[PDB]
Amino acid sequence: DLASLAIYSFWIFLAGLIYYLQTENMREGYPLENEDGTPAANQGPFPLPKPKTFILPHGRGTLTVPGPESEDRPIALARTAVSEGFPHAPTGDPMKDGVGPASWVARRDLPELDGHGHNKIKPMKAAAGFHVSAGKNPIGLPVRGCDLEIAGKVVDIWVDIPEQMARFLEVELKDGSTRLLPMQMVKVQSNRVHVNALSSDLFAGIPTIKSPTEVTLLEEDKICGYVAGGLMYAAPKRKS
Amino acid sequence: AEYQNIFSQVQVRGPADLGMTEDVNLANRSGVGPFSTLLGWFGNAQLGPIYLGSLGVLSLFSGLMWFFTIGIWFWYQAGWNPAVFLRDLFFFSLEPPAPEYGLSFAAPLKEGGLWLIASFFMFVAVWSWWGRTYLRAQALGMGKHTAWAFLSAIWLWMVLGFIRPILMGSWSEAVPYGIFSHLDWTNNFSLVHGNLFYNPFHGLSIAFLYGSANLFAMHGATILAVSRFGGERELEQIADRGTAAERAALFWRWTMGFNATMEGIHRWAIWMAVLVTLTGGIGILLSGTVVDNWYVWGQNHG
Amino acid sequence: ALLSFERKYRVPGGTLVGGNLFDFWVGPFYVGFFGVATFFFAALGIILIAWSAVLQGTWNPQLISVYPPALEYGLGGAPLAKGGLWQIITICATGAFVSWALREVEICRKLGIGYHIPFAFAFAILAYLTLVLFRPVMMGAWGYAFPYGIWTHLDWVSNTGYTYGNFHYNPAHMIAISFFFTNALALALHGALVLSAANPEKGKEMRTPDHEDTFFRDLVGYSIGTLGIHRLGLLLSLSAVFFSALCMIITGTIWFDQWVDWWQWWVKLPWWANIPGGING
Ligand code: BCL
Ligand code: BCL
Ligand code: BCL
Ligand SMILES: CC[C@H]1c2cc3[nH]c4c(c3C)C(=O)[C@H](C(=O)OC)c4c3nc(cc4[nH]c(cc(n2)[C@@H]1C)c(C(C)=O)c4C)[C@@H](C)[C@@H]3CCC(=O)OC/C=C(\C)CCC[C@H](C)CCC[C@H](C)CCCC(C)C
Ligand SMILES: COC(C)(C)C/C=C/C(C)=C/C=C/C(C)=C/C=C/C(C)=C/C=C\C=C(C)\C=C\C=C(/C)CC/C=C(\C)CCC=C(C)C
Ligand SMILES: CCCCCCCCCCCC[N+](C)(C)[O-]
Ligand SMILES: CCCCCCCCCCCC[N+](C)(C)[O-]
Ligand SMILES: CCCCCCCCCCCC[N+](C)(C)[O-]
Ligand SMILES: [Fe+3]
Ligand SMILES: [K+]
Ligand SMILES: [Mg+2]
């Protein structure tokens, strides 16, 4: 019976497909590890796939995955129990240490490039001739933290050139230096910009960028990690 | 208090973006369209440019001919009366030839021939458009995933209008061009074949369809939730995993015990979706050609 | 066991109930208060479905079915073998689903992300509740709900639909389907685009979002963008389910005749009701 054969075959095909998909999704994070770094004994019934190689543009190299997995950074946590499966308590200040929801990944300390090889992300001032086209222009607005104190003022918007979207607000602090705040973690209002994730004292603690008109992937992760970490770790100083 | 990234709060505009060049013949791009601020609260503001070329014109022309051929028959059914046209807009229908004419191209205009004409224009417009999705990837040095995926849709459409009618020996087995009439065709097809709920390929199709809504709600929400770490910049998270990609993986690992990569999720996606029309077209193709009644077939658990 | 990058994220915090009491994992799974609730509600529910299988007297998965009280019971309880189990199982299901969402919330908090995922999941739950709680209550009986069985619930879909003729003519159903189909189209395209950029022709470098924008513009004159398409997928699939629930919440409550006949409002408009010619004159 043709329909019987078709259905049996499909179920067989579908099982191969799930295997192909499951294994393809094991090109990062695997092999599994114990809470201490070493390979866990039980990896599961799915083997790692044969490697593949992405050729990166702009002379940036290749990526080959799966490949040796390391964090390439200190992880300031410690065990809080004597067996697998409990939490790992921060050993210093988890905001400053970049652990927990403040985590960052050791990405390439260069900036993402557009398809022409130029920095994808620039402050608007250096991006010709980008301008706010709709909505309230935040530039000029004082920035308020979750303690309801002004931490600074918005002095530019960093924009993604090829996608034409705001990505950070550059904010100036009491001391005259600036910080990037992710666009996605501010509420632009009519008389201010509000930042629920950070109290006003934690702005200075935001990771700073090395050159004032570009940002690297590494710096982006440190900034975004830090600001989001604020939700958990600045929730003592917040507030009704 | 907290913001959600469903709509942008601030738009920014720069020079119209004309696109990457690679091996594309730039003679064939239009120039940019207007910018829509309205669009810009949700996605991009920029309309255009678009690429024409010979295939594009063929498709577009051919596709309009299909559409106007259907619309000429509708005005006719309305005795050229505008008020009646709007009124009965969803009740008109350009029906295929009656079974007597089988697969012959002999049926008069008013009794099938017009349907064949419109079907011809559609066949040309779609396949030209398929070739278009391949060719525009090729010009840019990209993989052919979009044309392979589109081919899955085409398979169902081909089975409904062309492959199944031929195997059943008659054009009268095909789907009519009309809003209500196509739904009636659909219902009638289930009834006549013993209820499609008993067709395992139909039930798979469904699983995939509902599965696609699962998966895109899931994926879509995930990227939005990690979009504060740049999650939507997926191609760079692939080349260089960041905390966005890791928190995404980990949400799912902690929720349901396994998880994807920033690349592989898109393979789950391309497949969940294409399997809808893929299993679906098999289901229809077998209907009446090989199985007359899915209830019955189903009783012989096989 | 831990993914290679996982440890740094396994910190204390983000629980909504219980503080540190259920703040741990079991293998890959986060637990939490709501992980315990989920286990309880699901385990109870499965136990009871199996008990129901014993009263119905089968262990075949393609035959186990748990029906709601007959209509004659209205909105009251019914003995366990005659709809009560369904009633308890429905409470468990709802318990388990809502707990699953609140646990998702706890995971979001720990991980410092947005709440979009459980918010999205909550639409699926609202659809389930439309069919098993809201709609039955507005109609006056648990018996208008669907039974828990693989093939039997399909039987209920067919019977419920054909009570109103071709359910195709339910206009909220039309919209729902439109979103389901559009969603799948979008899913196919999105997956295909990203993969075509990350996996180009043999030997070439990875393409960029610039190429993905350029591709769609080339093909159809517009690209919605990499943020937009995720916004779109979320919206299409949620809109499908919202309209699914709407198409059912109205059926048997504010509209209860043949859905085909609903469309006569349009045809019967004074301006053209009586003009002859066409399909309806
Ligand atoms: C939505 C409108 C209708 C409905 C109409 C249909 C139609 C029409 C079909 C199904 C089909 C299915 N339905 Mg249904 N179904 C409904 C509501 C439900 C509910 C519920 C509300 O709780 C559940 C759990 C299911 C589950 C199922 C599966 C048995 C099957 C494939 C679903 C799928 O892949 O979705 C997408 C989701 C995923 C891919 C995620 C994976 C989900 C897995 C597969 C769920 C397993 C369910 C398990 C057998 C139930 C036992 C629970 C125990 C406690 C473990 N339906 C309502 C009443 N359903 C198909 C079928 O083949 O039926 C025989 C089919 O054709
Ligand atoms: C009473 C009716 C019957 C029924 C009769 C049928 C029939 C008949 C069929 C289905 C099919 C399907 N059914 Mg059913 N089905 C029933 C009840 C259900 C229920 C439910 C009750 O809950 C659900 C969820 C479904 C779900 C589904 C889908 C899984 C499947 C269609 C997949 C798809 O993406 O098609 C949509 C996608 C396409 C049709 C692809 C088209 C692509 C082409 C190339 C596009 C050309 C565009 C054109 C040129 C226009 C251009 C204009 C633009 C603006 C430019 N059915 C009942 C039992 N069903 C189909 C299937 O596959 O069955 C196995 C099918 O033929
Ligand atoms: C002959 C039957 C009628 C018809 C009668 C009906 C009836 C009756 C209904 C529909 C409904 C639908 N119809 Mg219809 N419909 C017909 C033909 C179609 C056709 C077609 C191509 O012809 C299509 C495409 C559709 C499509 C649709 C959708 C709009 C909708 C189903 C999706 C949904 O509600 O999800 C919503 C999703 C859910 C309810 C799933 C909830 C999931 C829960 C929250 C979680 C479950 C967890 C599970 C237990 C986990 C297991 C654990 C393991 C780990 C896996 N119908 C024909 C004409 N249709 C349904 C609808 O709108 O419902 C609101 C509905 O009730
Ligand atoms: C496999 C699962 C899903 C799927 C996948 C899918 N569909 C796809 C693709 C893929 C991967 C494409 O690449 C292709 C595409 O290009 O998408 C953007 C496509 C496509 N899917 C489409 C439709 C479609 N897909 C559907 C479904 C699905 N597609 C499945 C759910 C459905 C359903 C659910 O019924 C529809 C209706 C098209 C948007 C496109 C195929 C385009 C095509 O073939 O074009 C020919 C026709 C014309 C060129 C013109 C028609 C005339 C117009 C109706 C009116 C006039 C307007 C005109 C544009 C104005 C011009 C005026 C002039 C005077 C200047
Ligand atoms: C306003 O007035 C004007 C005149 C401007 C225009 C108005 C036009 C109107 C109102 C148009 C309305 C069109 C509608 C409602 C179209 C609806 C179409 C639907 C619902 C189609 C659904 C399904 C179609 C299918 C499955 C078709 C499949 C077709 C094929 C597979 C093509 C097969 C080709 C054939 C049979 C020809 C083969 C011939 C040769 C020579 C090989
Ligand atoms: C799918 C494309 C259509 C998009 C239309 C959406 C318009 C809604 C705009 C919300 C306004 C946002 N706000 C409050 C910041 O101004
Ligand atoms: C991309 C792969 C996703 C896998 C989803 C599989 C769900 C299977 C549900 C069973 C369908 C039942 N039936 C009647 C067709 O046999
Ligand atoms: C891709 C954008 C097009 C959306 C099409 C969705 C199909 C439904 C058409 C009816 C409009 C829906 N709504 C909510 C405005 O009523
Ligand atoms: Fe994506
Ligand atoms: K500028
Ligand atoms: Mg779901």
> For the residues of C216-274, what is the DSSP string, one character each?
HHHHHSB---TTHHHHHHHHHHHHHHHHHHHHHHTBTTTB-S-HHHHTHHHHT-TTTTT
What is the domain extent for residue C31? 1-163
| Residue of C164, C132, C163 lying closest to C147 (CA atoms) | C132
Q: Is C173 annotated as a binding residue?
A: yes
What is the domain extent for residue B53? 1-143
Q: Cα(C208)–Cα(C227) distance, rounded to whole angstroms? A: 14
Q: Cα(B216)–Cα(B269) distance, rounded to whole angstroms? A: 8
Q: Cα(B177)–Cα(B73) distance, rounded to whole angstroms? A: 10
Domain for residue C269, yes or no? no
Q: C150 and C16 in one domain?
A: yes
Beta strand ranges found along A40-87 (DSSP E): 52-56, 61-65, 77-79
CA distances C163 to C65, C100, C156, Å, are 22, 35, 11
Q: Cα(C234)–Cα(B42) distance, rounded to whole angstroms? A: 12
Q: Cα(B173)–Cα(B211) distance, rounded to whole angstroms? A: 30
Nearest to B14 among A1, A130, A220 (CB): A130
* The domain boundary residue, chosen from B143, B162, B182: B143
Total of domains in chain C:
2
Q: Which residues contact A179 (CB under 8 A, 6 or more apart)?
A: A152, A170, A171, A173, A203, A206, A207, A208, A223
* The domain boundary residue, chosen from B96, B123, B143: B143
Q: Cα(C219)–Cα(C270) distance, rounded to whole angstroms? A: 44
Domain for residue C83, yes or no? yes
Q: Where are the domains of chain A?
A: 2-106, 107-240
Total of domains in chain B:
2
Q: Which CATH superfamily is domain A2-106 in?
A: Photosynthetic reaction centre, H subunit, N-terminal domain (4.10.540.10)
Domain for residue C245, yes or no? yes
Atom index in ligand 4 nearest the CA of residue B67 equals 52
Q: B173 and B136 in one domain?
A: no
Q: Cα(A180)–Cα(A188) distance, rounded to whole angstroms? A: 15
- Ligand 1 mutation pick, B199, B204, B206, B214, max ligand atoms within 8 A of CB: B206
- CA A113 and chain centroid, separation: 17
Instruction: Tell me whether residue B212 is exposed, middle or buried, using C-beta atoms within 10 angstroms of its C-beta: 0 to 12, 13 to 18, 19 or more.
Output: buried
Q: In angstroms, how far is the first alpha carbon of chain B from the final one?
A: 58
B3 in helix, strand or coil? coil
Q: B118 and B150 in one domain?
A: no
A107-240: CATH, from 3.90.50.10, 3.40.718.10, 3.30.70.20, 3.40.50.720:
3.90.50.10
Bridge partners for A52 per DSSP: A65
CATH value at residue B185? 1.20.85.10
The three state secondary structure string of C11-31 is: CCCCCCCCHHHHCCEECCEEC
Residues of B in contact with C105 (CB under 8 A): none
Pinpoint the alpha helices (H) of chain C. 32-56, 84-110, 116-129, 135-139, 152-162, 171-198, 209-220, 228-249, 259-262, 264-267
Cβ neighbour number for residue A36 with a 10 Å cutoff: 9
B165 in helix, strand or coil? helix
Q: Is C41 annotated as a binding residue?
A: no
Given its phi and psi angles, is residue A176 left (phi above 0), alpha (psi -120 to 50 degrees) or beta?
A: left
Q: C141 and C63 in one domain?
A: yes
**For residues C8-35, b (16+ Cβ closer than 10 Å) or e, as one string?**
bbbbbbbbeeeeeebbbbeebbbbbbbb
Residue C14 touches partner A, C-beta closer than 8 Å: yes
Q: C97 and C158 in one domain?
A: yes
Which residues does a 6 A CB cutoff place in the pocket of ligand 3? B 186; C 97, 124-125, 127-128, 130-131, 157-158, 160-162, 166-168, 173, 176-177, 180, 241, 244-245, 247-248
Q: Which residue of C has its CA nearest to A74?
A: C8
Method used to solve the structure: X-ray
* The domain boundary residue, chosen from B143, B170, B194: B143
**Would you say A144 and A150 are in contact if contact means Cβ atoms under 8 Å apart?**
yes
**Would you say A185 and A197 are in contact if contact means Cβ atoms under 8 Å apart?**
yes
Domain for residue C151, yes or no? yes
Q: B15 and B104 in one domain?
A: yes
Q: Cα(C148)–Cα(C14) distance, rounded to whole angstroms? A: 35
Is there a cis peptide before residue A239, judged by omega within 30 degrees of 0? yes
- Beta strands B11-13; C25-26: pairing state: unpaired
Q: Cα(B292)–Cα(B120) distance, rounded to whole angstroms? A: 29
Q: B124 and B231 in one domain?
A: no
Provide the CB-side half-sphere exposure for A118 (13 A, CA).
11
Pinpoint the alpha helices (H) of B141-229. 145-158, 164-167, 179-192, 200-225
Q: B168 and B82 in one domain?
A: no
Domain for residue C276, yes or no? no
Q: Cα(B150)–Cα(B144) distance, rounded to whole angstroms? A: 10
CA distances C49 to C39, C45, C54, C65, Å, are 15, 6, 9, 8
Number of continuous H segments (helices) and E segments (strands) in chain B: 11, 1
Report CA(B208)–ligand 7 centroid distance (Å).
7
Atom index in ligand 3 nearest the CA of residue C245 equals 64
Q: Which residues contact B240 (CB under 8 A, 6 or more apart)?
A: A63, A107, A108, A217
Q: B247 and B193 in one domain?
A: yes
**For residues B74-109, b (16+ Cβ closer than 10 Å) or e, as one string?**
beebbeebeebbebbbbbbbbbbbeeebeeeeebee
Resolution in angstroms for this experimental structure? 2.8
Q: C198 and C76 in one domain?
A: no
- Beta strands A187-188; A193-194: pairing state: antiparallel
Q: C85 and C73 in one domain?
A: yes
| Residue of C76, C85, C89 lying closest to C142 (CA atoms) | C76
Q: B61 and B153 in one domain?
A: no
Q: Cα(A112)–Cα(B230) distance, rounded to whole angstroms? A: 11
H or E segment and range at residue C206:
none
Q: C146 and C106 in one domain?
A: yes
**Would you say C103 and C68 are in contact if contact means Cβ atoms under 8 Å apart?**
no
Q: B105 and B64 in one domain?
A: yes
Q: Cα(B131)–Cα(C151) distance, rounded to whole angstroms? A: 42
Q: C183 and C90 in one domain?
A: no
Give, in degrees to the nearest 5, the angle at Cα B78 between B77 and B84. Answer: 150
